[PDB]
Design a protein around this ligand. Structure first.
Ligand SMILES: O=C1CCc2ccc(OCCCCN3CCN(c4cccc(Cl)c4Cl)CC3)cc2N1
Ligand SMILES: [K+]
Length: 560
């Protein structure tokens, strides 16, 4: 009956403290690491008292009460502790900064990190949880413990290898890419739940789980959708203790009932508890039952059953169409289910419904042939340019559409909107649509949450406040901003020094793409010839005066 005690017994002490540390770093993305650890230790020791006696003092309080009490104890000046608890926790949820403007983590040397991992392993492992949750306020918390376990394993093995750098560095880069991809993929779930509602998320789950569990019964999928929606709703609301506990309660439920869900869950249900829940979320699509019936033109009871249970009918409709088309993207199947729902709203309210919806599956062909041709026409362009050059064509085009968007948002989003060809144009003609359009939904959400932080354009808000399924077609038709009169000029941004040649090639290309965006802001009417000219100009400039011994002398130059 005492909450924190029950959550401490289900998760154990090790996962309990780590989840509390994540919840504090995401709510307070500015407090020092040492301050949060003390509060986490003060919370953990009190939770041990309620485990010893659940009827003790303050044990009958809610987690939001206990969290917000010690969080309201630490440049951060909004008075989020607004009287009661409902106004308090939601204040911490709103002020979660998707772009907290924090200095990026500087990766020390391998032996420096290994010696820190050897001295105090706990403090070392807590900072990795701290900084990531600090910079990713909506990071999947139970998934972050999975990365922390793998972040611990890499240092455990590589710090005793003959070549620690050749061992540790390939593993720190992949976990760096896995976490950012996981955070962005999780940021899409919270935006769908918060900005569009639970019904929008459960439709995504029904579609994605039907492709992944096509042999599972419809009632089986609906139970998995109910639990998964409850899990992420708790995670997105900052209630990370119930999220991971229900995620563990769901991981065991899927494993205790594999015969009714999927056959690919054998290896997933053998891994430890953390890897178990991660493996299920990344398991492959099971095979669909052969010779499956199409639909049945169909029932005279369609409108009779569409009225007796609309969501069950549409949910089963989305279940039946998603389980048969694993090659369709999730956003497409939501368009097909939405189109089928709107047609039944007219036909059943019309005179003759049977003939009214007699060609509803023929008007799906234009909706299906749109992502096909898009991917078929963009992998052609991406192949004939490569990733970097294709990003530059996206940088100039996107900056011309909305020049008011900050250069970091433009550079970051255009760099990620260019990585679509690297990830998905390598899959066959059947795995392109779910790969490309669902990754695009993740990046377009990053742009929407970045623009939500600092809005400057009404057109971007219109596409972000529109249907989540039609975000990509909306942004593509934003046209060129012909009214960008404030095309300011500058020269300090174009002034470069010798510190640039100490960075990596990746970090140097970002700065060139940064000036490419600012150059377009300096003259939005610049042609691609003059744009590519200055792109090769500054590239050859920094190339000639770093292979030469000029230091901070040749960079003190100009051209424009
Ligand atoms: O940061 C900002 C701020 C301003 C802004 C305004 C408009 C805007 O348009 C976005 C719509 C692009 C859709 N493309 C379709 C083509 N595409 C692709 C690339 C390679 C392979 C494959 Cl297969 C594909 Cl589909 C990626 C997605 C973006 C921005 N961005
Ligand atoms: K990156």
């Amino acid at each position: 009956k005492s909450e924190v005690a029950h959550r401490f017994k289900d998760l154990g002490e090790e996962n309990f403290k780590a989840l509390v540390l994540i919840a504090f770093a995401q709510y307070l993305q500015q407090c020092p690491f040492e301050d949060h650890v003390k509060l986490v230790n003060e919370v953990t020791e009190f939770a041990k008292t309620c485990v010893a006696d659940e009827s003790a003092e303050n044990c009958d309080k809610s987690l939001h009460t206990l969290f917000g009490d010690k969080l309201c104890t630490v440049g951060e000046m909004a008075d989020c502790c607004a009287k009661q608890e409902p106004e308090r926790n939601e204040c911490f949820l709103q002020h979660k900064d998707d772009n907290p403007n924090l200095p990026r983590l500087v990766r020390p040397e391998v032996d420096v990190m290994c010696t820190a991992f050897h001295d105090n392993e706990e403090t070392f492992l807590k900072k990795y949880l701290y900084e990531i949750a600090r910079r990713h306020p909506y990071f999947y918390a139970p998934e972050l413990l999975f990365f922390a376990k793998r972040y611990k394993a890499a240092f455990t093995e590589c710090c005793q290898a003959a070549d620690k750098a050749a061992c540790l560095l390939p593993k720190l880069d992949e976990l760096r890419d896995e976490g950012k991809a996981s955070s962005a993929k999780q940021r899409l779930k919270c935006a769908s739940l918060q900005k569009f509602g639970e019904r929008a998320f459960k439709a995504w789950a029904v579609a994605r789980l039907s492709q992944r569990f096509p042999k599972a019964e419809f009632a089986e999928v609906s139970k998995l959708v109910t639990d998964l929606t409850k899990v992420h709703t708790e995670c997105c609301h900052g209630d990370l203790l119930e999220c991971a506990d229900d995620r563990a309660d769901l991981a065991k439920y899927i494993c205790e009932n594999q015969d009714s869900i999927s056959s690919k869950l054998k290896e997933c249900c053998e891994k430890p508890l953390l890897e178990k829940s991660h493996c299920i979320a990344e398991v492959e699509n099971d095979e669909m039952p052969a010779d499956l019936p199409s639909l049945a033109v169909e029932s005279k009871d369609v409108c009779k059953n569409y009225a007796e249970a609309k969501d069950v009918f549409l949910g089963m409709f989305l279940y039946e169409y998603a389980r048969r088309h694993p090659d369709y993207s999730v956003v497409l199947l939501l368009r097909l289910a939405k189109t089928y729902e709107t047609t039944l709203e007219k036909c059943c309210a019309a005179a003759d419904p049977h003939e009214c919806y007699a060609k509803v599956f023929d008007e799906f062909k234009p909706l299906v042939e749109e992502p096909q041709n898009l991917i078929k026409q963009n992998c052609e362009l991406f192949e004939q340019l490569g990733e970097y050059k294709f990003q530059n064509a996206l940088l100039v085009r996107y900056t011309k559409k909305v020049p008011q968007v900050s250069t970091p948002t433009l550079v970051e989003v255009s760099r990620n909107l260019g990585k679509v060809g690297s990830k998905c144009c390598k899959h066959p003609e059947a795995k392109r649509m779910p790969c490309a359009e669902d990754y695009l939904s993740v990046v377009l959400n990053q742009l929407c949450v970045l623009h939500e932080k600092t809005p400057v354009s009404d057109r971007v808000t219109k596409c972000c406040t529109e249907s989540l399924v039609n975000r990509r077609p909306c942004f593509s038709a934003l046209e060129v901003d012909e009214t960008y009169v404030p095309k300011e000029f500058n020269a300090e941004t174009f002034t470069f020094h010798a510190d640039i040649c100490t960075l990596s090639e990746k970090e140097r290309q970002i700065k060139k793409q940064t000036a490419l965006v600012e150059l377009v802001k300096h003259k939005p009417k610049a042609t691609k010839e003059q744009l590519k000219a200055v792109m090769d100009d500054f590239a050859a400039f920094v190339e000639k005066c770093c292979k030469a011994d000029d230091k901070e002398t040749c960079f003190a130059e100009e051209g424009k």
